[PDB]
Amino acid sequence: VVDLNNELKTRREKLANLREQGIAFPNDFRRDHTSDQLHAEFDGKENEELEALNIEVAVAGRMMTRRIMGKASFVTLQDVGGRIQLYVARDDLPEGVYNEQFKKWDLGDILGAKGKLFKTKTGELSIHCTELRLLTKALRPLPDQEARYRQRYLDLISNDESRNTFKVRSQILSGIRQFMVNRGFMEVETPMMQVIPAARPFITHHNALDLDMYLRIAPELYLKRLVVGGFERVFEINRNFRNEGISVHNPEFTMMELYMAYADYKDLIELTESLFRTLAQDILGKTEVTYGDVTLDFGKPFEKLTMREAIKKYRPETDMADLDNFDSAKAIAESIGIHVEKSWGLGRIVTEIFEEVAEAHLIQPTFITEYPAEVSPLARRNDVNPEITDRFEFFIGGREIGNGFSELNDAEDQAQRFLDQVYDEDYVTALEHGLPPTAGLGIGIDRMVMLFTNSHTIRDVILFPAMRP
Template identity: 45%
Template sequence: MSEEMNLSEVLQVRRDKLKKLREMGRDPYKIEKYDQTHFSQDIKDTFETMEGNEVSIAGRIMAKRTMGKAAFIDIQDKQGRIQSYVRKDAIGEEEYDVFVTYDIGDIVGVKGTVFKTKQGEISVRATDVKLLSKSLKPLPEKWHGLKDKELRYRQRYVDLIVNPDVKKTFIARTKAIKALRKYLDDRDFLEVETPILDSVASGANARPFITHHNTLDIDMYMRIATELHLKRLVVGGLDRVYEIGRLFRNEGMSPKHNPEFTTIEWYMAYADYEVMMKMCEEVVAEMAMAAAGTTKITFQGKEIDFTPPWRRVRMVDMVTEETGINFEEVETDEEARKIAKEKGIEVTKETSKGEIISLFFEEFCEEKLIQPTFVTHHPVEISPFAKRDPENPAYTHRFEAFANTWEIANAFSELNDPLDQRERFEDQLRKKELGDDETAMMDEDFLNALEVGLPPTGGIGIGIDRLVMLLTNSPTIRDVIFFPTMKPLDK
């Protein structure tokens, strides 16, 4: 008999059991609540004081061993697993006859007393067992395991049941985000919410998702950044604001990219990019401690030390270090384009020296940035929302933080000159007309806000998913998002 047929029979047997329970007036789906007084790990951790006490536990049956008039079951709750010892003479013959029909995967409630078996395992001696929900499908490991990663991501609810490390990863993610919130809340930042749908897609260079509002009869965009709305709030006098939320970018998928992802952006009036730099390394270190218990984490065999302070290097200087080419000595865009072509970097007749510096950095430098590093002073052409460096207006007071060759944060001394900002928007529009569909849109209302007056402000964005990947040694972003974007099975 084939495995598929075996599985079909199992599914039918479970449905038959449910039918019989309903005929007996024991429909588990009609139960609405259960008085759960204790959890597995708490009982184990406090056994000396818990021994002999009555408890009421609940969870999923993960293992079952029946020996005539007695049985052992392993119950999995939110903290882990604990064994329960069930005897016919303790719960009654009728109840025991029903109990032995329960399947692995069923959710039960058990009342009983805490004890330790002869083998030394802390357990609950059952006096009552109640079926709270019937599992109509067997857990996958019984048949073929949950080895297919695609299936794991599609059925995360099963993945969480059978793979304990998955739950640990998401608990670590939550701890990291709690540490992030606490860091900012302790410094008088206000958590806010800004629109996810907007009539303008701006604040970053990215391709947006487009939808349509029927009542207004206008196209709208899923947000690609929270930046411009948060800076509007700073204009309005909310000097310290942050938002943790989803962004949406209609771009490629990879181990580091999901179309929807979580970021934090925060803005602080009367601060600059150097203040953001210090805050960035401090908060990431605290997130590492919360998630991993150390600032020295191991990712895919590499140790990465998030202990502050991190290395700081200007982008143009790192390009010189890695290529021997000093673009500060290159006077014209034309000369820069010639050098780029000699190095095999694709450019057009419109490509500027600043853009070429960035291309050289991506090609020759990013792969060297394993340890946390702040790369600073980006060219103005690639930094439409950052203040210029007063000492060299070709560059900006901006940094990107890198670790494991990945960008994990991006920050500026925010541009608050409305005239300069308009010119940069117009430059972005020129690029869009030349075919670059990832450039920022003109946002007239944001320009209006700048004309009202934005104080000197430091701002930063951190990609939470990518950072959590590092802190939990997760090789793909799908491992740190509960329900990653997946191609439909029928496509």
């Protein structure tokens, strides 16, 4: 509506005026109370004690609602911790400000107010203002559902949903850090640019060294070098980059890899559990957490299932014996509607079948273990049965939330596998110097946040998701 176009005319003019009058953008006002502080400490006292205590306060915020009742007014201010009602009254206020100023201010303006606190007829706490003034002139007025992403600030002003999501995103991160730190872990910062990296790479170039670098897709190898070097309990929460498309998938998401010496994946499985269950318990309180059509329960121990067990559980009609023989597995793959490429060996047919049949039903928090060697990266072969490897994938809401291994510290085998998929020479060399047996944890922070704040898209948890120009 062209309504807003006049708003730009008026407000822009009002400011050219403020420049004539004084400092247009004063930075000298200092508050001392935020809505929530006031609420949590005064919300339960009737007028009486307020009248006695005579507690005067100072607040600052943005002007959301203004009800001009002639010579008295009710304005509601919004700061970082919520909303507080202000009683603006011409005679209690300095002379000439209520009419020649307050009334010429707009909604959206950043104001400061000092006065005695009380409560009105309808029951809301308010501040009888003996002082009130404009701090910043809002040149523009207050605010598909993608604009909510293009100008997150506008979003954070409007939606309490978002401001709560993000406020909690932080609460979670610092939560993870301290939980790990309690268990003798040390966070570390490794390179973001490597010279050697299954995903696409953000390739860049260094000027003063004419050498093409890569944005990390994971800090796995650098972290293990630290274990070799002796830091036996380290982790790193930070950005990883995957050069693909933005699936409302984000080009740069936050991951947490952590490593622990003298332990195996099972020990991480148990750590992962206690992590999710302590964060939900301290940050959200309820052990069951509503998430869309479903309710997630971190109260009861997570489900533990091998990939073999999973397939049988969700495709009950599978005569398992068929999976132990290539041809019967090929036919079990096809009859479920699976395009069996020529290269695929028993291990991939089966894992693929798991993906089709049971991955999506893993709604409750669940660990799937024993993945075939084939479909495995630098996966540590199981001693008793080398057909499978010592790794687990963590699942919540049908999504991959976690990862975990018993790290392959067998240099010669590692090396063979690098050449296998074609190679960090220095890594192998590091292994050759000796990496203690170690377990590695992998966690997608973003998805964990979604499953804790109820968000149902990654964009709802990244303050500035990449937008298509």
